[PDB]
Structure formats: C-alpha cells, structure tokens
Subunit: 388 residues, 4 copies
C-alpha cells in the first residue's frame, strides 16, 4: 500500500512468550528437510516467515556431508511458513548466495544475496522478486552482510555490509536502498572498531543495530541509523554484562567506545533492544562456546558502564546448543507499540557434535509480553544418535 514508517516506540518488555519453533532437525531425521544455518525471521504486512541459508541438500541426504563449510555455490536464501521446517517442498528461494538480508518496506520485499569466491564476491539486490542492483566486492575479502532482517522507513531500507579482514580493521559500509536502488552509502563512523552481522530493529524513526566485533570486542558494537537524514553513529554497549561469545567473565565496569579485551578473532551474531530502562540483552550462557541462551534486562545498558541485570529469562539451557540470534518485529501488527522479537539458531552437528558429518540447525523465536510470564527452556530436541 504505502511505505511503512517507524512511528511507534517499543512495547514494555516484562517477559518473553514463545512465538515460533520449527523442530527442523527432529523432523528432518525422517523427512525432506534442507540443511541450513544463519537463519532469521522476517514479516510482510500479511505474513511472518522463517528464513535461512540452505546448503542445497537434505539432512539425511549424502550431500549433507561437509555442510560445516560456509560458502559454496549450492547455498541460497530461502523462506518458508512460520514454524514449519525448511523442506525441499515448502522452501521458497529468495536468491542465490552464502550471505544475506531481507526486509519488507510496506509495499514489497527487498532481499540481498552475496555470492562469489573470497576475493571476487558480489551482492545482488532484489526488490519485488526481481534483480535490480548489483554491488561488487570493494575489499576483495568475503563481502558479507547482516544474516538477519534489515529495516525500512518510508521506503529507505539501510543495510550494513563488511568487506575485508575478520581479524583486523575492515571496510564496513552502510547502504541506504529505496526500491532496491542505491540512494547513498557511507563508510562506518563512530567508535566501533569492527562490524560483523548486524542485528537490527526500528522504533520512532530510528534504526538500531547490535553487531559483532569479531576482531577484539566481547562487548557488542551498536550502529544507530537515521534513515531520513541517512546518517549513523557507532559505539559499543557500555555494560559490563558482556554479550559476545566466546568472551571473558563479566567485569564490574564495561567499555563505551572500545572493544572490551580478552578474546580475539571470534564471536557470534547476537542482538539487543536498547531502550532506557526497557533494555534487554541476549547472550549465550557459556562464555566459552555457543551453548545455552538467556535474556537479561539491563537498564540503560548502552550508556551506563556499570549496568548489571535487574531481571532475566532463560531461553536455552547451558546444556543445549545455541548459535546465532537476531532481532525482528512485526511492524504491521495492531496496537500502539512494536513488540520486540528475536530468534536463536540452535546449531546441531559439526563442530561440536562430530559423530555426524553435517552441520545444520533448527529455530526457536520469542516476542515480548507486558505480563511477567513463567519461563521454559527451548532446546532443538533431536537425538544425534538417531542420525548415526
């Protein structure tokens, strides 16, 4: 109809209720489910769907051998109905590639897929299910993007990309697209020293992205974008409640403009809702691996370097595998506010479970409630032994 505009603020998050879960690996043990990773959730005005990067093979198929690898010519961004698994028969390919993002602007959807060898990748921007724009690698070192949904405001849908090293300074750019065409792009600015896989959401005409400093920081870099002025700033979450993984143990004081040191060259896609006292951070429970998952209310996390949790909710037990996590919201729901939501990728297989030769995942997602709901834990649920 008309372009959606971020006119509401966030609903108060007092707890998280279950939204979707596909139990993909469980079901896929005996049905035609595609091997995936790097999933996310994204809504259209009339439907919300699961998204992920297929590996071009089923979990039980012999070609599932080797799916731990990230970039091949057999990957593609696919979407399928909420809470269903990604099967060969219900998955809709949005585009071909090994890195992506996607978002609906109110009129139609923009999907971006990047493909290519490490030194010659290229992004192709799709709008209304048609290829419209292409961007060639600028640093010739794995051009890559969010791996979660982008956000639009009056037709402008900014997207963060990084090209260059993952263990040293790199070339991050913020592209502002409208109808799949480039309106403008900026280099990254602010104090964030390295950006990877930004998780974004929008409220009151401002887009907030919590990303991953793969180089030095265990605290998360944040990129706040103004989609009208088409400008942005960058810093880190000030809070000592560190949310990357692997990471050191929490200090009593965090860092606002530098990576918090302790772990180099590694991390995990993650997210947060930074909204004054209505601030919640997601993180793996384990400081060593992608194990477990919890949400912690840390009032003023973004700007208070001594902020510690005041409430929390466990999502996945530390005795269960987790993985990537990102934000999305249904900007077309009824009501006066935007209900924050997120998904957690539950990785199964390699490298942690090497008795199988594949790597895949299932998805669990939650959204906020103004009630103070009881909590449950949501594991993947598959028994690796069955796949042997």
């Amino acid at each position: 109809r008309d372009f959606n505009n971020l006119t509401k603020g966030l609903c108060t998050i007092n707890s998280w209720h279950i939204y979707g879960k596909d139990n993909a690996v469980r079901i896929g043990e005996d049905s035609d489910v595609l091997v995936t990773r790097e999933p996310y959730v994204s809504c259209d005005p009339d439907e919300c769907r699961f998204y992920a990067l297929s590996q071009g093979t089923t979990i039980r198929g012999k070609h599932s051998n080797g799916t731990i690898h990230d970039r091949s010519q057999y990957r593609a961004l696919i979407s399928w109905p909420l809470s269903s698994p990604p099967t060969v028969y219900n998955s809709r390919v949005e585009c071909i590639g090994w890195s992506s993002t996607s978002c609906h602007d109110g009129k139609t959807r923009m999907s971006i897929c990047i493909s290519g060898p490490n030194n010659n990748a290229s992004a192709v921007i799709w709008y209304n299910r048609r290829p419209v724009t292409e961007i060639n690698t600028w640093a010739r070192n794995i051009l890559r993007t969010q791996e979660s949904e982008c956000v639009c405001h009056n037709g402008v849908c900014p997207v963060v990309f990084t090209d260059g090293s993952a263990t040293g300074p790199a070339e991050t750019r913020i592209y502002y697209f409208k109808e799949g065409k480039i309106l403008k792009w900026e280099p990254l600015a602010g104090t964030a020293k390295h950006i990877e896989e930004c998780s974004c959401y929008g409220e009151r005409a401002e887009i907030t992205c919590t990303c991953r400093d793969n180089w030095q920081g265990s605290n998360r870099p944040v990129i706040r974008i103004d989609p009208v002025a088409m400008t942005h700033t960058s810093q880190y979450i000030c809070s000592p409640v560190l949310t990357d993984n692997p990471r050191p143990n929490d200090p009593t004081v965090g860092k606002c403009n530098d990576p918090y040191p302790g772990n180099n060259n590694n991390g995990v896609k993650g997210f947060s809702y930074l909204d004054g006292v209505n601030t919640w951070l997601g993180r793996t429970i384990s400081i060593a691996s992608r194990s477990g998952y919890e949400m912690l209310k840390v009032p003023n996390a973004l700007t208070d370097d001594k902020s510690k949790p005041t409430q929390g909710q466990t999502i996945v037990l530390n005795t269960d595998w987790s993985g990537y996590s990102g934000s999305f919201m249904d900007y077309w729901a009824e009501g006066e506010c935007y209900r924050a939501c997120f998904y957690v990728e539950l990785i199964r297989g390699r490298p942690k479970e090497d008795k199988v030769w594949w790597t895949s995942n299932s998805i669990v997602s939650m959204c906020s409630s103004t009630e103070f709901l009881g909590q449950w834990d949501w594991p993947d649920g598959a028994k690796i032994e069955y796949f042997l």
Copy 2:
C-alpha cells in the same frame, strides 16, 4: 466481513453422515505424517480444517519414540486441509504449545496455545495470525484448555481453562475474548465440581460446553455460557446414560448436580448436543477403556435424571480404538439451522498397543442428517504389525 452471530437453532438430528476421515496412521506408515493427538475440527467462513497437537516428529521417524508423553517443547497446534493427513508439508502451525483451542469469529481466527513446565505455564492468544494477549498460570499446575474449538458470537469468543489439580478441586475460569483481548473472566460457578477439556457449540445466542470431570464424575459437566451478558452456569447431564470413560455401568437414575460416583481421577474428552428431544450423547462403548464409539439419542438428557436412549448409531466398533471426541459446526453453511458435527480421535500406539514406541491417532468426523441413514463403522484402519 462482520462478526458471525449464533442466530440459528440446531437442525434435527435423525442420523449422522460421514464428513471427514484422514486415515493418517494408515497413510503415515509410508509417508511424512506428523505424530499427533488431541485433534479437532474447526471452520472458517470459507474452509473447514482438521487441527491437532503435533509431536514435532513423523510417525516413522526415530523421534516418534516417546510420543505417549503429553507436554514437551516440540508440540504445536497445527491445522491442515479437511480429510488430508497431517503431513510435514501441508501442516500449518497456528502456535506453539501442548494444550489449545481455536475459533473463527467471522472476521478472523483466534488460536490459543499454552506452553511451559507444569508449575509455570502460560497461554498466548493469537488473533489474525499474530500474538496479542498472554495469560500466566494462576494455580501453577498445568494451565490447560479445551483441546477443541471455541465459539464466537458478535466478536466474543469465550474459552474455558483449568489450572490446578486433575484429581481434586481446581481453578477453572471462563475467559471472554474479543479480537484476542480479554474483555472479562469469571471463576467457574454452578454445581460442576471439576472441569477439563470443554467441548462447545453455539445456537440461538447460547454456547453449550460438555466437559470432563476428571476428579469424581462419570456423568459429564455442562457449562452454558451467555456470550452477551458474559455469564454462565454449570451442572451435570442428569441422564443415567453415563458418558465419561472409564465409568461404572449405567444406573436407572442419574445425577443433575453432583458427579455420579464410581470412577475417580480419570476420564476422556467428550461432548453432546443438548437440545430437548433433539438431544444426542456420544460415548465410548467400553466402560473400561477408549474403545469403540457410539451416538445415542437421549431426549432431554440434560434435565431428565431417568432419560434413556430412544435411537442410536455406532460410529466405531468396540473392537477398535477410539479416544477424544468434540463438537464443531460450520456456522457459515447455507440453510436455516446449524448442522451439529463431531470428531472422534482414533488413538493408535501406546499405551494399548505397546509393540510400537509411539502414540498417535487418525480422525473420523460426522455431521447430522435429517434423514435416517444406514450406519457403518469407521475404524482407524492401520495394521500395527506393519510398523514393527
């Protein structure tokens, strides 16, 4: 379009004709059919569909082992086209949880799924395929609901929930929802002493629910709701034709306001159409287990404590497994009256057939005819031996 209003009375039930049957277990022996239980049927203005609580695995899948258990994080309310089986590829997830209800109000559908551990469950009310309201457990003991469709009148869709013990007095509430938001709730009143899994239908602006007294009664509690005044009453079916299971043998006189004693702490979801002389009761044939199924015309059952059958029809032979049964009607059909319909859950597997490690079911449903039709029996039809 506009909210549907219960303006018609029931059509005269002179017999039952076959409506739908999915032969799920038969077909699922060699195809991707999800393991389910607690099924039901529910209509939209333009389509009637089968519903059930999937177990997040196929019947032939190795994860089918253990599906006798009721509540896990892998369950979800799913719906699929009438008479098809619930397959991985045609099942649409309505929400995540191990207890549910769903109904269309004329404009759109409301689905409710409850999930959580025993002492911390929570219900989330979905409307127009979006999460709108959440209710936390009030007795901290398996918050649960109907397991069959709710009914709406002018936007108000009442739903009965129970929280607390299943073998002692509990906390039952009647929630009146409109567009997924709570208009009001009451505590249970009347003479029913315990309520579980209400089966409901509506006619002439009154909603009747036949439920399950799991604690002491073998006769069924009935909750009649006024969706305009948003008030209700409760009693038991007066008739000596006892309809719960397990149950004692039929007496010559029933009880109108107390459970009929003889069997404690057990039962089965069931239903009835209470309409003066046009009154029909459904019950398993066996007084000991969920075996067989029949419909009996017992004029004035609800209010006559000596009422005995005047006509009847066998649905499932006592030499075949049955299970839950509930009511639904197509409130958007043509004609001057509402055609009563019901479904019977045909449980296969555990606990009665323990040579297999799973528990699932198929569905058979009938609707009334003003003709006096010949009868046939409708078993599940699968040979357990094939699954060994």
Copy 3:
C-alpha cells in the same frame, strides 16, 4: 458467476490429441503416491483436474496390500492438478466414500460420495464444499453412482444411481439436483435393462450418458436426459460394433432396444459421443479382458443397427492394460463448440498382475481435434518387476 448452460454443439472429431497423463504408477514406485482406481477428469471454470477414489494408502506402503477390494472405510474421492500424480501432499479430498460423481455448475461444484456396508449405504451430496443433502439406500444392495463427472445446465445437474443387483434387474434412478438439493427424481425408463456407471456429456441442452449393462448386454445402454423438462429416455447403441468388455465378437447387426447377448454379469465403465456422423465409440481392443483401447468413428452408431467404423485411432496397445473410461469436456473453454474429451484408466496390479499385492492405476486422457493427427499409443509405463 452465472450457471453454465449447454449452448454449443460438439466440435467435429477428426482425431484425438493428448490432453493429460500422470504416469502415477511409474512415479509412485519412488514417491508418496496414493493407490487409486475409478478415476475421471472434471473442469471448473478456471481449472481442469484429475479425480479418483483413493484407497487411503500409498502404493509402496504396506497397506497397499489388499487394494483390489472395492469398498472400505478408507476410500475417498480426491482431486489433484491435471497430469500430476495423486500424491499424499497434493490430493484434495472432496468427500468420503467408495463410489462418486462430481461436476461444476458454473457457480460452484457438486460432489457426491456414497459410503456404507452393502445393505446400508448412503449418498451425501456436497455443494460449495459443504454437505447439503443425504439419500439413503433404497434397494439395500450397494447404492452406487457414475464414477465419472455429471453435467449441469442452468443449475440442474442430473446424476444416475443404481441400487440393487448387478446381475439381475435393479433400481436405477435419475436425480436432478440444483445447489445440492433434490429438485426431483425419476425411475429409469426406456428399453435399457440394466444401468451401471454412466459416462455423460452435454451439448445443446441435452445430456447423453453411455453406461454399462452389467447383467446381459455387451452393447452399451444410453440415457439421454432433458435437464430442463427433467425427463429422460433410454435405449442401447444400435451398432454391431460392441463396446462393453468382456464381450462376444462383433456381429453384422446390433440391437437397438435389448442387450446384445453373449456375456453375462460383467462389464466395464465406458463411453461414447453420439452425434450423427460425428459419432465416436471407445472400447478395449480385447473382447476378453481390459486390455488395450481404441476409438472408432461409427457414423450414426446410436440409431443404425448395421453401422460399422469409418475411421479409428488406437489409444492403448492390446499388449497394455486399460480399464474404465469416461467422458468430460471443458464447458468453459473459448470457441463455438464443445471439444469432446475422455480418459482411460490404466489398471496395474491385481488381478492381472498378481506378483504384487496391490491394485492401482494411472490416467491418460485425450480430447478431439478437427485435424487428422498422427496417432501414438499411451501405456501406463511402469515395470511391475521394480515393485517386487
């Protein structure tokens, strides 16, 4: 929109071109294809689909054992996209039963399914995907119907049923339905002595049905219906080119009002287009079994007792299995005339191929061309050996 009216005459049939083929048994050897029989084809104003009576099991499934039997509680009328196979995932159940018919009147579709034990069957008439009318068995001996599409004219859709013996006189009725309700019914009249499985088509406000005299005739009975006056007549195809199976060898002179003797108590559903010189008959090649299939132009077959073929076309080689055949046309196509079409059921399995324990079929269908096209033969194509 508005009720379709049979306003056109038939196009001239100079040959037959391929229309649809699903290769169901071939494909089903390694995919989830339902076991079927008694197929047909039927069009809506915007789509033409294949129809058949599923057996409630896949061909490879263990429950495929025993599918030679005709009537069970696991059968249902299903429809699926043209030329696809009937799979568990694309088949749409129209109703439950072991005998059926279906037709679109221009506004919506009427489907009829009969179910029940031999002495207590009942038909239920569905309209707009809802149950509307029910008819109980009148002779208590396998109430049954066409097994191919019915035809409508201005809302009136006549259907022929038979109840009673298949090897002696029986009670055949012509029901005239409108919006799924009975407008009127007649007993069979005319000289046909026994009617089974009528194949019908309509042109210029007249409905012609070529049926099966299972009792004594090897020539085919024809029922011509006037859907406006709601009256009909009956006779046999006068032609010596006998078209039932099994049958005696062709004589030089046929019979116009009596069964042509030679074979008792057996036959096969078949059809014909009786249109003066534009008359074509379909028949198995073998006079002994359902083997092969050909179309023969026999000018004035219906009324000329010495009529012999003037042109012909082989459809299935006598070295391939055939089966039922029936008529249908797309009454919503463009043009000034109705293009005659038919389907041939290609039965595989029992009783002729007893190395397998199942019985199923695939479908091939053709429509007429005003060209004189070259011919090909269209067998099922599956290798039974593969199923062993």
Copy 4:
C-alpha cells in the same frame, strides 16, 4: 492486462550476476525430484519459473533407468518455482510431450508440446491452460521445436519448428500464433542451411533467435523475426569465435552465410545476444564435448567475420558438465531496458557418467549487470558416487 510489446532495447551487459540455481541432482539424491532434461526459464508478468521436460520418474526411482532416451510417452513439459528443484509435489504440468516451448504474451501463457512416434508426431498449442490448436507432422520425421521460451509482441508469438532430417536439409517453419491460433506460417528463408532448437529474445519490436545447425555448421544460425510484418531472415553469426559443440578450433575468420565446416551431424542448443558492441556469445569451453561454459563479449559478432572477444566470464569450469543453454528475459521488470538472461543445463549421468543408468540435469541461470562483477563458477555440485 494488455499484450506486452517489445518497446525497450537491451541493457548494456558489462557482466553476469547469478539469478537462479536449483541444485536439483544434489537435492534429488535424497528427495522426490523428477528426472528431467531440456530445461529453460520463462516469466509471467508476476512470476519467473523454471521449465523442463520431465521423464515421468524420480532420479532415485527404479524407472530412472533408461532416461538417456529422448522421446517416450512418459515425458511432459513441467514448470516449478524459480530455483526450487522439479519435485513430484511442486511441478506443474503444462502439457504432454517430448519437445516444447512456452511464452507469456502479457495476458496469458501459450505452451506447445509435441508428442508422437518419429513418423507421426503432432504439436498441440495450449493457451490459458487449454488446448486450442493442433499441427500434424509435415515431414514425418520427429516434428520438434525450440526447447526454450518463445517471445510475443502485441499478441503475436512466433515459434520455430523443424520437421525432417537432423543430418541433412529439413523443413523448418516459422509459425505466428496469437491466442494460440495460427495467424500465418512461413518456410525458413535466408542463408541458414539447417535449424534446430532456436533460442530467442526480443527487443525494440524485433525477435532474434540463435539456433543450432546440426547438419554442417559449428557457427550458429540466426533467425531475426519481425512479429508485426510476420516476416523473417536468416544467416549465421559471422564471427570466427565458433559457438556450437562439438566444433573445430576457432579460425581467424568466420562465415556469414554458410555453415563453418569441420563437424557434421551434431551440436548443442545454445544462444547469444546480438546487439552491436553490446554482443555476448555463450559456448561450452570444450570444443569436443558439453563441458564447461563461458560468456564472451564479441562486439558485432553477427556481422563482422573477424570479430574476436574483448571481455568474458566463465560460468562453468571445463572440468564440469554443461549442456543446453538458452535465452529468456523478464519483459515485465521495472526500468528502461530489458536485462538479458540465460540458463545453462548441467547434465549429469549418461552418456558421460555411465556408472549410473540415468541422465538428468540441474539448472543455473544468470542475467546481465551494468557493473563489472567478479566471477565464480557454478557447477551442478552432485557426487555421482553417492548414487551408486
């Protein structure tokens, strides 16, 4: 809505970006994927889809044995969503046959399938999913057509057919259809000496077809059609960069009106975009077999007999199997020009990989970019060893 008219010229081709890839053989190793060959891509105003000639069996099915053969009664033109594989459950049959073409005219689609024995084939033209016209074989020697999409302009959709020898002069015709009816047909004229499988595209009211001279030429014949005057001309691509396969090595000078000699009686469906300096040719890398695939910019190829490449892009490595290739464009995209696109058929199985008894393929397709994008290679990706 209204007939589409070829009003735009081609966009400048500076490189090729990935458009679609289905990884069919990879996925099909463990899922219900139909065996195919002779694929292509074609768009409707609201969707672009993959097309191919199914073999009426799955790749893992036992009937996959023998699929190297071209013409059987089990083949059919099917279409399925972009980048999905052709599965039994998502494939839509357009018509039955072993040779085809298809195109949307702006209002609806025309599909043509030819079937029959070698000496008696017949084409049937479908429009709006209905059979409208039939053409009988004129040379009685494998009537055949494009195997890729046709193009329309103001309702007129020309199609090239050939009937007669594949190793000697034959009878090629250009049919001009409108709404599936024949407006006119011509015999082939110009200097092309033999035509097979034309690959076409349209721009500025002119349709260009690059075909295959199976008889003597290693250079490609080109047929330029005027869909308004309904006339055409024919010649060969003048360029010494030879693009058929097998073929001799490139000379320094090509031939404009005669086949370039060196290889007789063989070839492969291929294509090109002839547009002055914006001219790009596709060809297998190997001069001996269907191995590898590249795009070469050869300014003025069609008319300059000494034209050699000025830029290029590898699509498939010479160490990977390729096959047929053809053109298509999305004539309903936004923008001022038509973005050239093509697909390459990646044949797997027989005859080159005879350890398996089948022959099938997957599809990769690209479209042009005005950017100068980095290149990647796109192989089928399946491991034959897994199928053993």
